[PDB]
């Protein structure tokens, strides 16, 4: 007698993401040495933290010039990785292959104009449930920060992760109503002789950004 | 947090700047080895196919995530659906050897046949992009340069031949990647580009 | 999980709870190839083969 076994129904098909291996055909092959080559990366979320990329504003330019008039809003957009202003960064390009995310997103602002032009800015976040503010006075009641130009020409602000659920979606190109995660608003408080000077802005991941559930929508 | 812009040094600002709190992170799903370990379809040809990792379409998950590295290394697995018998041949071998049976040949057994092949190229590492081409006759130069800017020919894992090939899928093992490159998303025309999520 | 009929054994015994948690197993009888897609993903991904 030999060991009796019972072949089972519904088991053993092919699945394209199973955790098991194939059978070897060609043996005893040795590789050329490749140890310590320059420039390695293991997690795709470390080049997203070490290297930020430019935003996209109306006109195909990654910056916003100071206005000389009674309207003080520089740029305003929804908070989503599928937004139009984020369509060229490394963050959105990578996030289009996952379904959910959570954590912080960083923004960097750099001032360019000459040594005798000065300015002052402010940035706020408006959570969902009420239309966003149009004036700095009204936005002064949200979570905000405020800086100005000097010897150090850069600033960094972290958009907090605030929601009911523990994770949030990266999908749903809206082209419609019903914002879900809120807006962010950049304002210009005042300025001295800085007409035409630009402020470039970049984006990158945060300390505790996370990304889960890979998918393939052919983008 | 202020700093000098031109210096190109990394700087990160946490939510403790205005009284917040920093939470725990789990980043298992973005590892290179993990995410690149899955099958990807490829349009096959009838008789002879050259196994080259640049034949995955650039829009699929594996295709683009592979193309954001300049140099790479991996073993290979293939899954073929064929008729007749299937013969594999190592890197750099004559094309007459595709007819000889002593080379690893898998006899037909339905429905398909999954194999595991080593890395047999002479270089220490492969490349996704190569600057070798150093770059009336209007169309002449067009179709001359267009065919004069491919990759070198020794960047492949071998070849397979059968009486007819119907499917062919690639899977990478032990992937390593060097020197990142750009990776872009679909550019919306409107204020947002939205997938229609699962909803009735 | 709310597509089980309310009169069956599992259907009603499930419906006497307000909140719940569980993993899932499915058994499908089909023709062709079967593709699964996680929660909250675009409906175009139902055609791609890289998904399980």
């Amino acid at each position, epitope marked *: 007698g030999i060991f009796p076994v019972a072949c089972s129904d519904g088991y053993g098909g092919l699945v394209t993401t199973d955790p098991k291996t194939a059978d070897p055909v060609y043996g005893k092959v040795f590789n050329p040495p490749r140890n310590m080559l320059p420039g390695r990366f293991t997690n795709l979320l470390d080049v997203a933290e070490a290297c930020p990329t430019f935003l996209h504003f109306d006109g195909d330019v990654p910056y916003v010039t100071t206005k000389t008039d009674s309207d003080r809003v520089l740029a305003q957009f929804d908070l989503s990785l599928a937004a139009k202003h984020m369509s060229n960064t490394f963050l959105a390009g990578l996030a289009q292959y996952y379904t959910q995310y959570s954590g912080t997103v960083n923004l960097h602002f750099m001032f360019t104009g000459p040594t005798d032009a000065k300015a002052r800015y402010m940035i706020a976040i408006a959570p969902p449930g009420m239309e966003p503010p149009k004036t700095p006075e009204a936005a002064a009641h949200c979570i905000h920060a405020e800086w100005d130009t000097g010897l150090n020409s850069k600033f960094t602000f972290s958009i907090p992760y605030l929601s009911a659920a523990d994770y949030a979606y990266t999908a749903s190109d809206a082209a*419609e109503t019903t914002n879900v995660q809120g807006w962010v608003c950049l304002f210009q408080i005042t300025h001295g002789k800085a007409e035409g000077d630009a402020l470039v802005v970049l984006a990158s991941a945060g300390k505790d950004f996370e990304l889960r559930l890979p998918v393939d929508a052919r983008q | 947090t202020t700093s000098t812009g031109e210096s190109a040094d990394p700087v990160t600002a946490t939510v403790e700047n205005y009284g917040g709190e920093t939470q725990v992170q789990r980043r298992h799903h973005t590892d290179v080895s993990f995410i690149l370990d899955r099958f990807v379809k490829v349009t096959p040809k009838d008789s002879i196919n050259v196994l080259d990792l640049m034949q995955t379409p650039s829009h699929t998950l594996v295709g683009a995530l592979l193309r954001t590295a300049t140099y790479y290394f991996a073993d290979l697995e293939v899954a073929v659906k064929h008729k007749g018998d299937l013969t594999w041949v190592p890197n750099g071998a004559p094309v007459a050897a595709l007819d000889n049976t002593t080379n690893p040949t898998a006899y037909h057994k339905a429905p398909l046949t999954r194999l595991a092949l080593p890395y047999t190229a002479p270089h220490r590492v492969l490349a996704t992009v190569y600057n070798g081409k150093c770059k009336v006759r209007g169309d002449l130069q067009v179709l001359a340069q267009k065919a004069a800017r491919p990759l070198p020919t020794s960047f492949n894992y071998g070849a397979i031949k059968a009486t007819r090939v119907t499917e062919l899928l690639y899977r990478m093992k032990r992937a390593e990647t060097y020197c990142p490159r750009p990776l872009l998303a679909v550019h919306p025309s409107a204020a947002r580009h939205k997938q229609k999520i699962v909803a009735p | 999980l709310m597509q089980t009929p309310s009169h069956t054994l599992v259907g009603a015994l499930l419906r006497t709870a307000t909140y719940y948690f569980a993993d899932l197993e499915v058994a499908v009888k089909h023709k062709g190839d079967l593709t699964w897609v996680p929660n909250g993903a675009p409906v175009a991904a139902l055609d791609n083969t890289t998904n399980p």
Partner: nanobody
Amino acid sequence: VQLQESGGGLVQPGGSLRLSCVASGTVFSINDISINHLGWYRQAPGKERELVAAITADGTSAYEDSVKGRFIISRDDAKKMVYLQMNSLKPEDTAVYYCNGLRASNAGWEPRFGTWGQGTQVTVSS
């Protein structure tokens, strides 16, 4: 993202019309579905555009009690098209029809949920 329609123009009252909704394809996003609730709107000259009918995800259909009982609506999801039947032609049909979707709030259906439509007009006058 923007729905096209066809089957309109200049037509005489008393015929038989079947307005057709040539959708852009409905690229609509994530698996959160079964909120597929389309509808039809009419628009009057200088007077606010009014609803006509609305179709729910599977089978329910409501109409404005002005046209109630006279029109028939149905959708074909297997090919992803929706149509509008026009029988019992009256002088009241002179309006531009918009094939669009609905919101299904607690009080009443809300509009798009879209950018806008183009429309097709059926003005009949004898």
